[PDB]
Ligand binder design. Structure first.
Ligand SMILES: CCCCCCCCCCCCCCCCC[C@@H](O)O[C@H](CO[C@H](O)CCCCCCCCCCCCCCC)COP(=O)(O)OCC[N+](C)(C)C
Lengths: 69, 175
């Protein structure tokens, strides 16, 4: 029965280790992502949460019929 | 027979007395024993020897599986999952081995009680004290862990016991 239908314990052992490593990495990544999101929303210095500002290319840098603009 | 080890399951030298009848009346027990052995044991022995010689024609072996000694839970970092898994499996195997040790001692005690007859209270002191020591150690190790037990909980219980023992020892030495 063991030869025909089942395998050794080493296979399940090492598969369990691989699964545990994947899940632990995923958990640490989720926590890190939450912290990064909080920091980016608080500060705004990162790529995320970059709300638009007025484009400076719309400014007209020409004499304005009045020296004091 | 030699099917098991005599050192782990010891037995007294098995002293039995000799028949010394005071009467010439025939003993029904001996005649019944002769009838029983002739009519039962001989065919049973013949069948068993036939089965044994059939087995001897095709002989194969099975081996006891050996496990290494991986680092325990005390040598694992706080969030290292691989070493934690290794230590947890090793601890569970050790727990099973300790359970079987307690089982062996209990079997010894039961055999002593049955064998010694009416003197079991006095003739089974060594087995009783062995069981007392083994049960005390097992209770110190694994009792009150509850369901969802783990190597970490056992380690915490041991650390608490060691802290209490150290406090008591220093208080005693402070006298
Ligand atoms: C000498 C024997 C004397 C005693 C006999 C004992 C009888 C036992 C037989 C009963 C079997 C119980 C069913 C359990 C089947 C396990 C299914 C699965 O777990 O096994 C698969 C294995 O496949 C097997 O071939 C399963 C075949 C069994 C199919 C059962 C169907 C029986 C139904 C018959 C009904 C009658 C039909 C006629 C209708 C009129 C696994 O696939 P795989 O990952 O690859 O193999 C991994 C292990 N390896 C790598 C070592 C090989």
């Amino acid at each position: 029965i063991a030869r025909t239908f089942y395998d050794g314990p080493e296979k399940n052992y090492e598969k369990t280790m691989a699964i545990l490593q994947i899940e632990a990495e995923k958990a640490e990544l989720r926590l890190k992502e939450l912290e990064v999101r909080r920091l980016m929303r608080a500060r705004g210095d990162g790529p995320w949460y970059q709300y638009p500002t007025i484009d400076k290319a719309l400014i007209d840098h020409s004499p304005k019929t009045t020296p004091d603009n | 027979p030699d099917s098991w080890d005599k050192d782990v399951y010891p037995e007294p030298p098995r002293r039995t007395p000799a028949p010394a009848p005071q009467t010439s009346l025939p003993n029904p027990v001996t005649y019944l024993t002769k009838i029983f052995d002739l009519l039962v044991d001989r065919p049973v022995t013949l069948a068993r020897e036939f089965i044994e010689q059939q087995h001897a024609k095709n002989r194969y072996y099975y081996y006891h599986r050996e496990f290494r000694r991986v680092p325990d839970i005390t040598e694992c970092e706080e969030k290292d999952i691989l070493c934690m898994f290794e230590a947890e499996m090793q601890w569970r195997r050790d727990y099973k081995v300790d359970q079987e040790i307690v089982n062996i001692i209990q079997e010894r005690l039961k055999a002593c009680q049955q064998r010694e007859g009416e003197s079991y209270r006095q003739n089974c002191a060594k087995e009783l004290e062995q069981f007392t020591q083994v049960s005390k150690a097992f209770q110190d190790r694994y009792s009150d862990l509850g369901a969802h037990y783990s190597a970490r909980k056992c380690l915490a219980k041991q650390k608490q016991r060691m802290l209490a023992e150290r406090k008591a020892a220093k208080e005693a030495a402070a006298a």
